[PDB]
């Protein structure tokens, strides 16, 4: 069960990484303005 | 208890993800401007 | 020890959440401008 | 080793906290402009 | 297996930190504007 949960945590962390990348992309758009 | 706590950690990560999404929404509002 | 450290981790994640909420509030201030 | 690795994870979380505080300071600088 | 997953989690956290640093770099660029 701990392995299962640690893998679930890894998925959540990956989701956060994806969101952070999206923020960066938005910041880039703001810089272009 | 360790499984229980890992599940509590997952809940917190989910909150953070929700908050990251809200940041993105706000950045999009800034970009409109 | 593991229970103790997982609870410490939960404390750090709650601090992060707090900070993310503060970031959202600052983005709303920028939006007002 | 489990204790050691959870402590390493805490160090990384603290580094994230430090960075989030830095972002907040920056947003405050943007708010002044 | 658990040690391996904790290490994989550490790699994700490091990646988040790298992204957070990129965000700060972008904010500094915005501050120059």
PDB file of C-alpha atoms in Angstrom, chain A:
ATOM      1  CA  UNK A   1       0.000   0.000   0.000  1.00  0.00           C
ATOM      2  CA  UNK A   2       2.765   2.531   0.680  1.00  0.00           C
ATOM      3  CA  UNK A   3       4.156   1.995  -2.772  1.00  0.00           C
ATOM      4  CA  UNK A   4       0.714   2.543  -4.233  1.00  0.00           C
ATOM      5  CA  UNK A   5       0.322   5.805  -2.331  1.00  0.00           C
ATOM      6  CA  UNK A   6       3.830   7.020  -3.166  1.00  0.00           C
ATOM      7  CA  UNK A   7       3.024   6.457  -6.845  1.00  0.00           C
ATOM      8  CA  UNK A   8      -0.171   8.411  -6.436  1.00  0.00           C
ATOM      9  CA  UNK A   9       1.862  11.220  -4.867  1.00  0.00           C
ATOM     10  CA  UNK A  10       4.242  11.107  -7.839  1.00  0.00           C
ATOM     11  CA  UNK A  11       1.226  11.615 -10.126  1.00  0.00           C
ATOM     12  CA  UNK A  12       0.089  14.643  -8.156  1.00  0.00           C
ATOM     13  CA  UNK A  13       3.592  16.101  -8.285  1.00  0.00           C
ATOM     14  CA  UNK A  14       3.652  15.615 -12.056  1.00  0.00           C
ATOM     15  CA  UNK A  15       0.357  17.446 -12.323  1.00  0.00           C
ATOM     16  CA  UNK A  16       1.894  20.340 -10.369  1.00  0.00           C
ATOM     17  CA  UNK A  17       4.895  20.401 -12.693  1.00  0.00           C
ATOM     18  CA  UNK A  18       2.583  20.635 -15.652  1.00  0.00           C
ATOM     19  CA  UNK A  19       0.777  23.584 -14.044  1.00  0.00           C
ATOM     20  CA  UNK A  20       4.013  25.327 -13.236  1.00  0.00           C
ATOM     21  CA  UNK A  21       5.054  25.025 -16.895  1.00  0.00           C
ATOM     22  CA  UNK A  22       1.800  26.585 -17.874  1.00  0.00           C
ATOM     23  CA  UNK A  23       2.424  29.467 -15.504  1.00  0.00           C
ATOM     24  CA  UNK A  24       5.784  29.995 -17.119  1.00  0.00           C
ATOM     25  CA  UNK A  25       4.149  30.101 -20.487  1.00  0.00           C
ATOM     26  CA  UNK A  26       1.756  32.773 -19.269  1.00  0.00           C
ATOM     27  CA  UNK A  27       4.604  34.789 -17.794  1.00  0.00           C
ATOM     28  CA  UNK A  28       6.227  34.607 -21.207  1.00  0.00           C
ATOM     29  CA  UNK A  29       3.112  36.010 -22.790  1.00  0.00           C
ATOM     30  CA  UNK A  30       3.154  38.846 -20.237  1.00  0.00           C
ATOM     31  CA  UNK A  31       6.772  39.573 -21.116  1.00  0.00           C
ATOM     32  CA  UNK A  32       5.895  39.832 -24.764  1.00  0.00           C
ATOM     33  CA  UNK A  33       3.406  42.558 -23.867  1.00  0.00           C
TER      34      UNK A  33
END
